[PDB]
Amino acid sequence: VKLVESGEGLVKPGGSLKLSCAASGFTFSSYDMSWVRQTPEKRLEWVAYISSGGDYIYYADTVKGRFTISRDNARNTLYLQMSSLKSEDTAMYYCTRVGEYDAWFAYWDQGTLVTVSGASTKGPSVFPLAPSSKSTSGGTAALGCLVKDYFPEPVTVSWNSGALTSGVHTFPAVLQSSGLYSLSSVVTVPSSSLGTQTYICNVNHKPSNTKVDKRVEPKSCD
Amino acid sequence: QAVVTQESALTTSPGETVTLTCRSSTGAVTTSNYANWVQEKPDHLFAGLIGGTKNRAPGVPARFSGSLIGDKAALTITGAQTEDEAIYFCALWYSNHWVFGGGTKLTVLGQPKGAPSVTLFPPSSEELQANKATLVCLISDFYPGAVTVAWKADSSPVKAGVETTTPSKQSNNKYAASSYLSLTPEQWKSHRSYSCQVTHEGSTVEKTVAPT
Amino acid sequence: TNATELVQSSSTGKICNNPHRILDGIDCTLIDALLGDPHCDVFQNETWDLFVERSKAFSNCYPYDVPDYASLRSLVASSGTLEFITEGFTWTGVTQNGGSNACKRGPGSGFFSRLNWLTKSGSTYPVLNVTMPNNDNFDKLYIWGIHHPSTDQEQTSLYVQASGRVTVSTRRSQQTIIPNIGSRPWVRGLSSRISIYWTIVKPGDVLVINSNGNLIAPRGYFKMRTGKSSIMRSDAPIDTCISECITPNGSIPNDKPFQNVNKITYGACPKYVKQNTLKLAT
């Protein structure tokens, strides 16, 4: 099965936000569904639960009357309306395709991160990372992209819009002493196709939609 | 109440028998608590392993035996392996809620080679024109994830403008880390070269870039 | 020369629907159809020669527990029919024909079609002493159960007495179960479960049921038979073919003395081995 969640952004305390997990791969409307979260302290917490679409919906005493879980048996999508948000609602929320008749917490996802801070959502500053020229190892090469001074997390970086899936590592972000992050991704590409292929850095910041493409060229400069 | 407590970090070797606990604060963990066991793999892969305090998923080997030891639960792994190194959570059922533990980080002795490969990048021409300078030292494909970062500029120790992240697991169960040196465009062009020193279990890897 | 083969290594991927009768449990299992699950209303009083349980089956009703599940799933399979005869027991002061919105048989409440939920009748719950003899000349299969509430407050709210008991005995057997109340995890939204039991009645035998609470009543019995029928767990489709041997990986021919696809077979299937090719000269 496959369940992908969306709804990344920044909210202020007392605000609202809707999360959605599009469940695919197997039969929907037959299994129960729930929402689970993991705080930045890596503490698991149960949030909500729905019974195949349900007359039965129950939330945690922390999130009763502030959240509401919904299900769409037609679109195969499960929604989670977060309302009257607090600072303590900051976590990566997971959508679980679990059925308590045989399994308790079987399927989890890659998560979606929502932050409730009240701070200003700022935009990243993308700078190109120039490839290595000399003192080679007979090896490929290393070029990348620098996503500097963004908040909040996360940012997703692809290469050639899904055409460069082999030899790329996206490194985690650093919480610098400014309340902002900084991420770096570097690909490994042979120097033979280094002056023939155009390599594009595609950064897409979901909270504040900054879909920027960045070209990394040898600049004939030192 | 509903406070679930367990161990924070354990370690074992392939072939040995492990046992994880799940203690309850309001009293004894009864069979009516339906102890759950999740498996936190890298890239946030929380796979559910055991439910009902003994019922096991169809894809989990028979080495995972769920039981109720003493006044708490148990996760016995008879025949531990390298693929069992992960964070394992417990979830006890109380008549109205679903509470979780803190997680027991299981360490396993294996993965023969964890030597890191280091990559260093100077600031970009666009960044230098923007009155900013930030060098990037990327450490990847190493195990375990315990390294010390050191930057050097013209044979002198550098400890200002350096923020560095704790290594996290990659997709191949190896660790990776990143170190950044924030400077001013004047300091970058005034020195001969900058070096990022990485040491991991005796072997020291340091790479140097120059403004040419 | 050449060498003829003696092992069937290959399969069809689909099940041939001849010459046996195949019954597909598209969204239902054999126990879901045996109890009468509202989404399993196609298989009521149906027949078969081989049942097919799919991995895509589910249950949209009361979470039920079946002790001796494998012992029940096998004796009904070889019966080859859901031949259910409504009986009409005497449930006096029982407030029968009950259900819940989780076992939805239409808009409002509902329950299983082959079993009956007996609530309280006002503020009274009498003790049950009913009997139903088997004067015919065939074995009877009676399906019943017991209710496990979530708390003592809904046990006292559905049944006057704080604790129940269901005793279903025959001239050679006796079954007495005491309910175990508990707020179990929400499966399909309910903190309650139900355990399912059955009792077989032979010719010359009389069925006796006794209870003082927490009884799920039957609406009749099932006509048992001794057939070549069975049940298979497969996700292979049904094709408009004719093949004697059936395999969970797809039907195979019976021309070779051995097979290599699966040890679980049905029909005039060859012997099972693990070797790949076996060639003999001719």
UniProtKB/Swiss-Prot annotation, chain C:
Residues the record marks as carrying a glycan: N2, N45, N129, N249
Cystine bridges: C16-C241, C28-C40, C61-C103, C245-C269
Record's protein name: Hemagglutinin HA1 chain
Gene that encodes the chain: HA
